[PDB]
Write a protein that binds this DNA or RNA. Sequence first.
RNA 1: GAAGAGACGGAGCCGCAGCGAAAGCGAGUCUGAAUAGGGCGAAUGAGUAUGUAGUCGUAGACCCGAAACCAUGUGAUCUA
RNA 2: GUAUAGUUGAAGGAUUUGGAAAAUUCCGCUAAAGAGGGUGAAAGCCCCGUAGACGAAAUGCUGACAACACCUAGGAGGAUCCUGAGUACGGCGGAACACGAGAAAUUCCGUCGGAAUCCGCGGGGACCAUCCCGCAAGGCUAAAUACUCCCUAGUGACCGA
Lengths: 206, 146, 54, 64
Amino acid sequence: PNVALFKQDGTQNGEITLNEEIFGIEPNESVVYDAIIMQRASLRQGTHAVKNRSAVRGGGRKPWRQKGTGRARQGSIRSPQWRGGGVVFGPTPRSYSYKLPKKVRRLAMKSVLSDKVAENNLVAVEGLSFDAPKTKEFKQVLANLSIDTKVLVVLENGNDFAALSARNLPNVSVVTSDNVSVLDVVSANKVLATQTALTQIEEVLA
Amino acid sequence: MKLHELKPAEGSRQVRNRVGRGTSSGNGKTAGRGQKGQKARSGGGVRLGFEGGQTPLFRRLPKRGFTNINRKDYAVVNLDTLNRFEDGTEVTPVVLKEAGIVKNEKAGIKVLADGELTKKLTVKAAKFSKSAQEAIEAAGGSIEVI
Amino acid sequence: AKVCYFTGRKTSSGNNRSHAMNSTKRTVKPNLQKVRVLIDGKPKKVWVSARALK
Amino acid sequence: PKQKTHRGLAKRVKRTGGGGLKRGRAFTSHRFHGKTKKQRRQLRKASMVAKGDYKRIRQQLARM
RNA sequence: GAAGAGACGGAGCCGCAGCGAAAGCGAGUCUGAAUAGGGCGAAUGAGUAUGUAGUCGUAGACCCGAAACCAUGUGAUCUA
RNA sequence: GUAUAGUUGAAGGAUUUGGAAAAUUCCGCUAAAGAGGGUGAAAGCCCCGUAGACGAAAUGCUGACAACACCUAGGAGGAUCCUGAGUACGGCGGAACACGAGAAAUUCCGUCGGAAUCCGCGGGGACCAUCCCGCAAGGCUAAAUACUCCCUAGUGACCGA
């Protein structure tokens, strides 16, 4: 499918053809769902722990005698019914991360990108460069293209002057053509891209 | 599909049992285990395969056999796999394979004779069956034990 | 009779079995003898194993 | 870890292609003069599993 | 590579062929003098990777409760 | 070059409710800085800071290359000489190897016996013959790996008396 081309505000050059094995492929839903959950659940640190009856720094003698006191029988000061005892079945440090087959990951990426093509949410630029890192001019650029909601900017490689002018409101977030993950894309509404970032995507995903 | 409207695949993520949490859930007061006895204690249950003091099944029947020290067994592919190599290739147990026909050839490829071939191939292998040579050369192909 | 002046022989321990393999703990000691020898020209008395008197 | 599979059953039982198991019969090592000659012919030939005793054993022979 | 998605990596594992203790044979094989009969197989009859739930095994394994056993140490200011 | 003190570092006013505004409402500004904390209630523009740029008299630490120390050669001949001794190995008693003396090699320990010298010796799971692979009984040796009393800087679908 095709998307028109805009300069900086110079509007409507020609269009770009994209792959119908990447940008036309009738997206699944359950795959995308499980990809989002596996990506977001992998972010945890499992660092949390709780002491128990062998680690609670206490004593290891029965407090009492067994009989004569006329009393319920106790064997240690620190044990879970007492206050300040150990905890039975506390939370321990774990992993939480897991991986999927290689086919469904690429199926997920192709599905999401063909979806955002299908709703006219890719706005394609010829080129983007600044002489100096000015965040005001980048705001004027987004004012030129009439984008207001949450957005993505995708670059080629180290365009430092196109990266350093995007520490704006968190409407804007910055990806190269390498780190384009799933949760980077799905959380946004419209995505900006150059010409050559699209072709470097079409080299990697293939 | 987006973040605040997630939907799972239907019939594909169950809930749990939380056992010992109230009398009207169904599984409170002895937690699905019942009255006394050593299945209901802490970590009870006997080891696997135990009939009380009755002599179990593996002592009522005798030990039998041994294992060869030099068993050399092959990586059989029968005949119908060969029927997609249209005309003359040197079907060979080496670099040919490349498509999941043979992974981990065990001691060299053996060829069996089930069951029908209409090609004119030529075969390298390490062992054949007595109907395999007849079935291959009936179609006019050369075979060799190499 | 503790160690050897020449070799490294010294006492140690090990098991003890008896006809149905019950195990106790022994002390297996070397043969040792007090011999008058010459350390550096001066005569000395020291424990020397019977192996190294050949 | 892993389930350590039992070795009493690995030396007495082989697995066929349907799912069952072969079993070499009993009473074959002893006073044959007590038993008759039908009893020492027909107890040469190995047989199969009784379906009840394939319930407690099946997890022990998880792979072999 | 950002304690991360995110690609490289085909060693290895499972199914696609079984029967026999084995030498071996192979849509067939074993016992057998037998090509007879019988057992197990074959005749269309799908698996594998991951998630989740029920159940089991090794771990203290649903928690509380003994009389006792073993190894270092402290005590004859009471008492013999 | 770096570690142990540091320097600089942008941009807002008024109204209403207030005891007090960072709250609300009009009209503006900054951003290589919209991480965080505090201020009379919730602050991009009040403060401490963050991005960025700058800085060590003194004491370590890490590299680079100069000096200085070391250490190291070819080819042919094969008469003679050297190649780790109470050692290898065997009996008897025990331990290690997944291997409980079993048909039991390979490794040690105690005791008693006790080899050969290149035409030599050891090993290939009792033992022999053939073939194959190796030189015991003298030493040294960075990395790839395990732990955190502590020091700095941080993080957490960890706790909140």
